Curated annotation (Swiss-Prot), chains A, B, C:
Pathway: Aromatic compound metabolism; (R)-mandelate degradation; benzoate from (R)-mandelate: step 3/4. Its EC number is 4.1.1.7. This is Benzoylformate decarboxylase. Its cofactor is Ca(2+); thiamine diphosphate; Mg(2+). It is an enzyme of class 4 (lyase). GO terms for molecular function: acetolactate synthase activity; benzoylformate decarboxylase activity; flavin adenine dinucleotide binding; magnesium ion binding; thiamine pyrophosphate binding. Pfam families: TPP_enzyme_C, TPP_enzyme_M, TPP_enzyme_N. Keywords: Aromatic hydrocarbons catabolism, Calcium, Decarboxylase, Lyase, Magnesium, Mandelate pathway, Metal-binding, Thiamine pyrophosphate. The lineage of its organism: Bacteria, Pseudomonadati, Pseudomonadota, Gammaproteobacteria, Pseudomonadales. The gene is mdlC. It comes from Pseudomonas putida (Arthrobacter siderocapsulatus). Homotetramer.
Length: 524, 524, 524
């Protein structure tokens, strides 16, 4: 067998059937004879390739496979890999390298010192020392991406390796099963359960690895048993809990003092599937108030090590959430009371308040819609205004790297064809990965893109205002016609300059058979 | 003085007056109070930021200064840095980091292990250990980018450093002059001159560092004295010689055997300002034929070390070219005969042959036009069909990384406001950095963009044909309306479906007062 | 030809004839059939291997070739490489890797991610992608080590590559000549010469790259012409000037304020072949006083970039020193007056003051002796008390890494068989690389080792005293019998408990036919 044939067999046997890519000559011997049971999804720039694959992996809860061209293609994707690292996204990034005979002279298209290129944003990065090693290296990549804590990996493969003979002993790779589905030993688990049962005023904080594990329902059971309020850890990449459940208390503000004050009076705070914590703004103060004990369950040693407070348990989130949900006592305390309806912001017949947009989406979208957020000045209001009952309903760039949501929404929609995806993207953010729109058109992936056009990098103008920072350049982005950009890439385009038109455009978009972009004029 | 004030003083004293950027919160304390004598050039994605800065640096022959946001912004620019590394572009890449107090917890927006991120594509990469070190680190960055061999450098700066007190002793940084304007010692230079004077059939090969040094005219003198044919080294990022000079022999094919055969019978081959060699295709054979001696003059130790053949001298290209041009004898051999006119390809009233496009550009464009090439299947014909008399007239992605020419053409045009820039970009290539168009519109930088629309990644289809590789996915890019994309970003848009319309559109574009995009329907 | 045969041919053709090594199985296919024209020098631990090679390279002014075993052997040598980096020592470090078929499984003896292991202490670090690349990679290593600024490089080679067929086109590697023997262009050199000729009170500071270049005599001429005092840059790894020449002013103290005060009133300070500056102690103040201009000539861009003050010129030290020495005017100012005799410290009939040891060495040793210093509390007195007339007469661990001088003295003695080497090593320092003694015995390399036994890490006790730091552990090293250690490794051993015995032992040692260790009881 060739390295090509053995590698595709390995991929298929390991459940991979899609290649997200932007092609180049170094990968031609890999892409030729492309198997009929695989699908190739082309995107026009590598940030888009990786963002699409990332959304697909996150929504499908399975690894996604990528093929890029050399250093330039890898390089173009490195901002996307920063997000993938923070979201624990299981991405297998392969990159075509020059033929081994041309590497020493540093021929054009050579990826110099290739494995160092994507560091520090990958779990594992490698170039095999021989062609016959390639299937084994691919196996390593699959499992490194897939083991807890999941994350992106990188494999560089010389052009000429594919046609070479594989090791017949590579068949042993095909059906390997590798599990990290582990939970705390019984003795120490019983000690934790007892501490939860004994808490007088517990609280729960949930992060993105809950949603990745589909541990949401187990966390609902846990919260109901403990009669505990539930917060989403700050800077949330995903939504881990039904947002109209009576225990839900919303998104924690990303500040040290803000969080310890929210947690004050809670004697035990159980954090599941989050870093402790993904703070953002400078908000100095106490990590916890006196009287609060924190216990973190994380899938990631690097998270456990860096928490500034609390105990930690490093284990699989799904296995821990299921165990805890089934072992805790039913508390006799009263269930928390649901948060009220948010207020309706007054809206005239002019430009749209963001709040109006989110209220209208919540009203009109299917109850199993999936939202993406890259509208950076409006996140808090979005989280208060969307009723998201189901898992897998929300994604936000986990490293704050713009250019995620537009391509990721395409990958999520590909993963979840029955669930309408609605990406709410600022006018600034929309440009980073604009060319991803083409993939939605070409493959008829019916994502809806809602562009929040306020003319500015509003979150930066706001921050500059908080600082009283004057004379800051580069904060405005006038003069972008998003309907023309959508036409450029073959996506149906609508506008909404007022609420009547927003409702009209949403109605049209929700019934369309293809992707649709709606440019919304929002208050600036 | 603050670190902010001292750093801007250092930059101004070192000749920097422009910041190419995409802003973020980590850089707000750097960008606030932006000096009135500086200009900020915003671009919408970091590949575009760096490509614009790169064109500006390459054309201006001086360092360009960049400011990006954290890991995601840096990451989005890493494909652009792959090109900058290969072109020896003096780029000072700064990236905003989190406040030092929030780095340990890995707050959102922290650039983890920041200095490793852009490796291996930078000459120097650093994060200072204290605020007062920042001006010194900036000095290091300026000089590392600027010393031969020039190249990109990276500096990560925590948010909170800018407002801190600077070291008063940082004034010693302001006026440092650092020179690498060096040439071979007299004794060994005389030995080289004697070998050149004694050669019976010399040839000269020139690379991009000649044009970077503005050594072009000295190389013309050298070639005339030696009566030597002159080739451009393969995969050429720049044009180092007048392309209708009688000695000019064009672009070398990027193959081992092809080059040794071209050089056969030449007893001494003098290579100046190129790697030996930037081969591309697999073309195995002899590095040199018997009877050919190669001598390389390079500004880059890494080039000298990796050449598979020949002697080398590591020195400044400008200083070596001037010395050699003035020291060699005038040979009594006959001057080489100019290459003939290329043939005119037959052209019907339909879609344009690329050859027709280049012939028409050569006819219509000013004699001091500057061309960029990212039309990958047409490079050989472009090089034969454009009379480029002047230095600084040609740029091509030096690492083969697409997404260079569109933004770089904007930066070149900004550097050279009196010289009409014409970027010839394939339909595939145009997408990688499409959003750069906006910068041209916003700042009214009057670049002309000629999109070669053949519907495909033609260079890849061709290669697949050479291989007889079947069933390769992802090679076609139908369904892109480049006039709509140009409208999206505020750039005047024209079409050319036939030669009459090409001439009409070029006439209109050449007289426009702003940037213009022309979508050309080319034979596929 | 095999890779083995081609590689040894390359090494011989490039002037390499000695392999400094500690063997292992991964290197057996390299070491077998060891050519009869090469010599292998075994040392018992890899810090010793590299230190011996380093002394040999520094004294011989040519690259030295090393072979180590995998990661553990490389790792054991990394402290030695820290010194080699700071001394610009041209060291070609090769390390045996596992067979390519066993690398993926990470068999015992695999060097994982090998090229990253010695970073950041090497100029270039690499593992070839195929066997036939190995000769080319070796060529790269030779030239990278040898080009200015010289330094250590690393090459990892899989076991199985050696027996494979080489590329016949690797013959083009054999006789490559690569030069970095460059100096400032004439126009700018004339500007520098004019500034030197116009200075009213110039001073000269010289660093180790002067001695490496054998630029010493040119610097003497330069100093005599300019009538300038000459200092050695701080933390000196080498001696660049005759220490009883009338211009000589000794070793600069390694502090910021101390140096600017020494330079006060000097209008132009010319630094040659040094960093600006290798400060050590915290001594804050002005980098230069008002009225002092500094101009640095350095072979190292990294030095030029990081200087906090002054202009810089990056060029070959030998070529610049020769040019400047021959171009400056003869000043009419008076020649500086020689420094007086240092005082004689009162010495009773008991333990030896270090000053007494150095005075006695200066009296008794041949005028062409070579000294090494790893007696860290006595450096200033050593520099004042040894008349070192000739180049190549002094070495001190350039990164401050102990374990250098004992092995390096063996390599220096091997390089310079006619010059008696005398290594003055503290009792603490002697242990780091103690096993190097064996190599001197086995090869009968007649180095003299003078162990300064004060029972302590005296430089650390002194520093702790300056700080008034109490309760510091680990500063004393009682209970070491250096004569027994010398016997252990087959080296003749002497003691000196008083001055009479010191003179007796030195007399015996100087006339011995083999290496000799003298344990001196020094005042503590
Ligand atoms: C790749 C990248 N570049 C720059 C930024 C900095 N950035 C920028 C540029 C923001 C403004 C986004 O503007 P928008 O129009 O998408 O949304 P708002 O107007 O609601 O802020 S928010 C933010 O962190 C980033 N996070 N990621
Ligand atoms: C960033 C990046 N991604 C992918 C490639 C691979 N690539 C691709 C995708 C090419 C086709 C470009 O198509 P085009 O339409 O711009 O021009 P032609 O149709 O004339 O080839 S040529 C080439 O090397 C690359 N070099 N750089
Ligand atoms: C490898 C290494 N380890 C530790 C040190 C720290 N160190 C130590 C341990 C010194 C004392 C050396 O003691 P000595 O006996 O050799 O000489 P003195 O008694 O004259 O100080 S000086 C110094 O910097 C070092 N520089 N290098
Ligand atoms: Ca409602
Ligand atoms: Ca699915
Ligand atoms: Ca906005
Ligand atoms: Ca014509
Ligand atoms: Ca200009
Ligand atoms: Ca095309
Ligand atoms: Ca004396
Ligand atoms: Ca010798
Ligand atoms: Ca001691
Ligand atoms: Mg990296």
């Amino acid at each position: 067998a060739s390295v090509h044939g053995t590698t595709y067999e390995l991929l298929r046997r390991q459940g991979i059937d899609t290649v997200f890519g932007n092609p180049g000559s170094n990968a031609l011997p890999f892409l030729k004879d492309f198997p009929e049971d695989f699908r190739y999804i082309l995107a026009l720039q590598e940030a888009c390739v990786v963002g699409i694959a990332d959304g697909y992996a996150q929504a499908s809860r399975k690894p996604a496979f990528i093929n890029l061209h050399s250093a330039a293609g890898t390089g173009n994707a490195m901002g996307a890999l920063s997000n993938a690292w923070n979201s624990h996204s299981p991405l297998i990034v392969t990159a075509g390298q020059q033929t081994r005979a041309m590497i020493g002279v540093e021929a054009l298209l050579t990826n110099v010192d290739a494995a160092n290129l994507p560091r520090p944003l990958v779990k594992w990065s490698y170039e095999p020392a021989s062609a016959a090693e390639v299937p084994h290296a691919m196996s390593r990549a699959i499992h490194m991406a897939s083991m807890a804590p999941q994350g992106p990996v990188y494999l560089s493969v010389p052009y000429d390796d594919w046609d070479k003979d594989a090791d017949p002993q590579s068949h042993h790779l095909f059906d390997r099963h590798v599990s990290s589905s582990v939970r705390l030993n019984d003795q120490d688990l019983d000690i934790l359960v007892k501490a939860l049962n004994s808490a007088s005023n517990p609280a729960i904080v949930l992060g993105p690895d809950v949603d990745a594990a589909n541990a949401n329902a187990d966390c609902v059971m846990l919260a109901e048993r403990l009669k505990a309020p539930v917060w989403v850890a700050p800077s949330a990449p995903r939504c881990p809990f039904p947002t109209r459940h009576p225990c839900f208390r919303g998104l924690m503000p990303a500040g040290i003092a803000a969080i310890s004050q929210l947690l004050e009076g809670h004697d035990v705070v159980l954090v599941i599937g989050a870093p402790v914590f993904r703070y953002h703004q400078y908000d100095p103060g106490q990590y916890l108030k006196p009287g609060t004990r924190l216990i973190s369950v994380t899938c990631d040693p690097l998270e456990a090590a860096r928490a500034p407070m609390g105990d930690a348990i490093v284990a699989d989130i799904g296995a821990m959430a299921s165990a805890l949900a089934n072992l805790v006592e039913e508390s006799s305390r009263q269930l928390p009371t649901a948060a009220p309806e948010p207020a309706k912001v007054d809206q005239d017949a002019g430009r749209l308040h963001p709040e109006t947009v989110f209220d209208t989406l919540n009203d009109m979208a299917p109850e199993n819609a999936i939202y993406l957020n890259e509208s950076t000045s409006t996140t808090a209001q979005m989280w208060q205004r969307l009723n998201m009952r189901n898992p897998g309903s929300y994604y936000f760039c986990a490293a704050g790297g713009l250019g995620f949501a537009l391509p990721a929404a395409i990958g999520v929609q590909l993963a979840e064809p029955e669930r309408q995806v609605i990406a709410v993207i600022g006018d600034g953010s929309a440009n980073y990965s604009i060319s991803a729109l083409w993939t939605a058109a070409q493959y008829n992936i019916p994502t809806i893109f809602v562009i929040m056009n306020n003319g500015t990098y509003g979150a930066l103008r706001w921050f500059a205002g908080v600082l009283e920072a004057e004379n800051v350049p580069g904060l405005d982005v006038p003069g972008i016609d998003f309907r023309a950009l959508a036409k450029g890439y073959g996506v149906q385009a609508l506008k909404a300059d007022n609420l009547e038109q927003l409702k009209g455009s949403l109605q049209e978009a929700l019934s369309a058979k293809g992707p649709v972009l709606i440019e919304v004029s929002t208050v600036s």
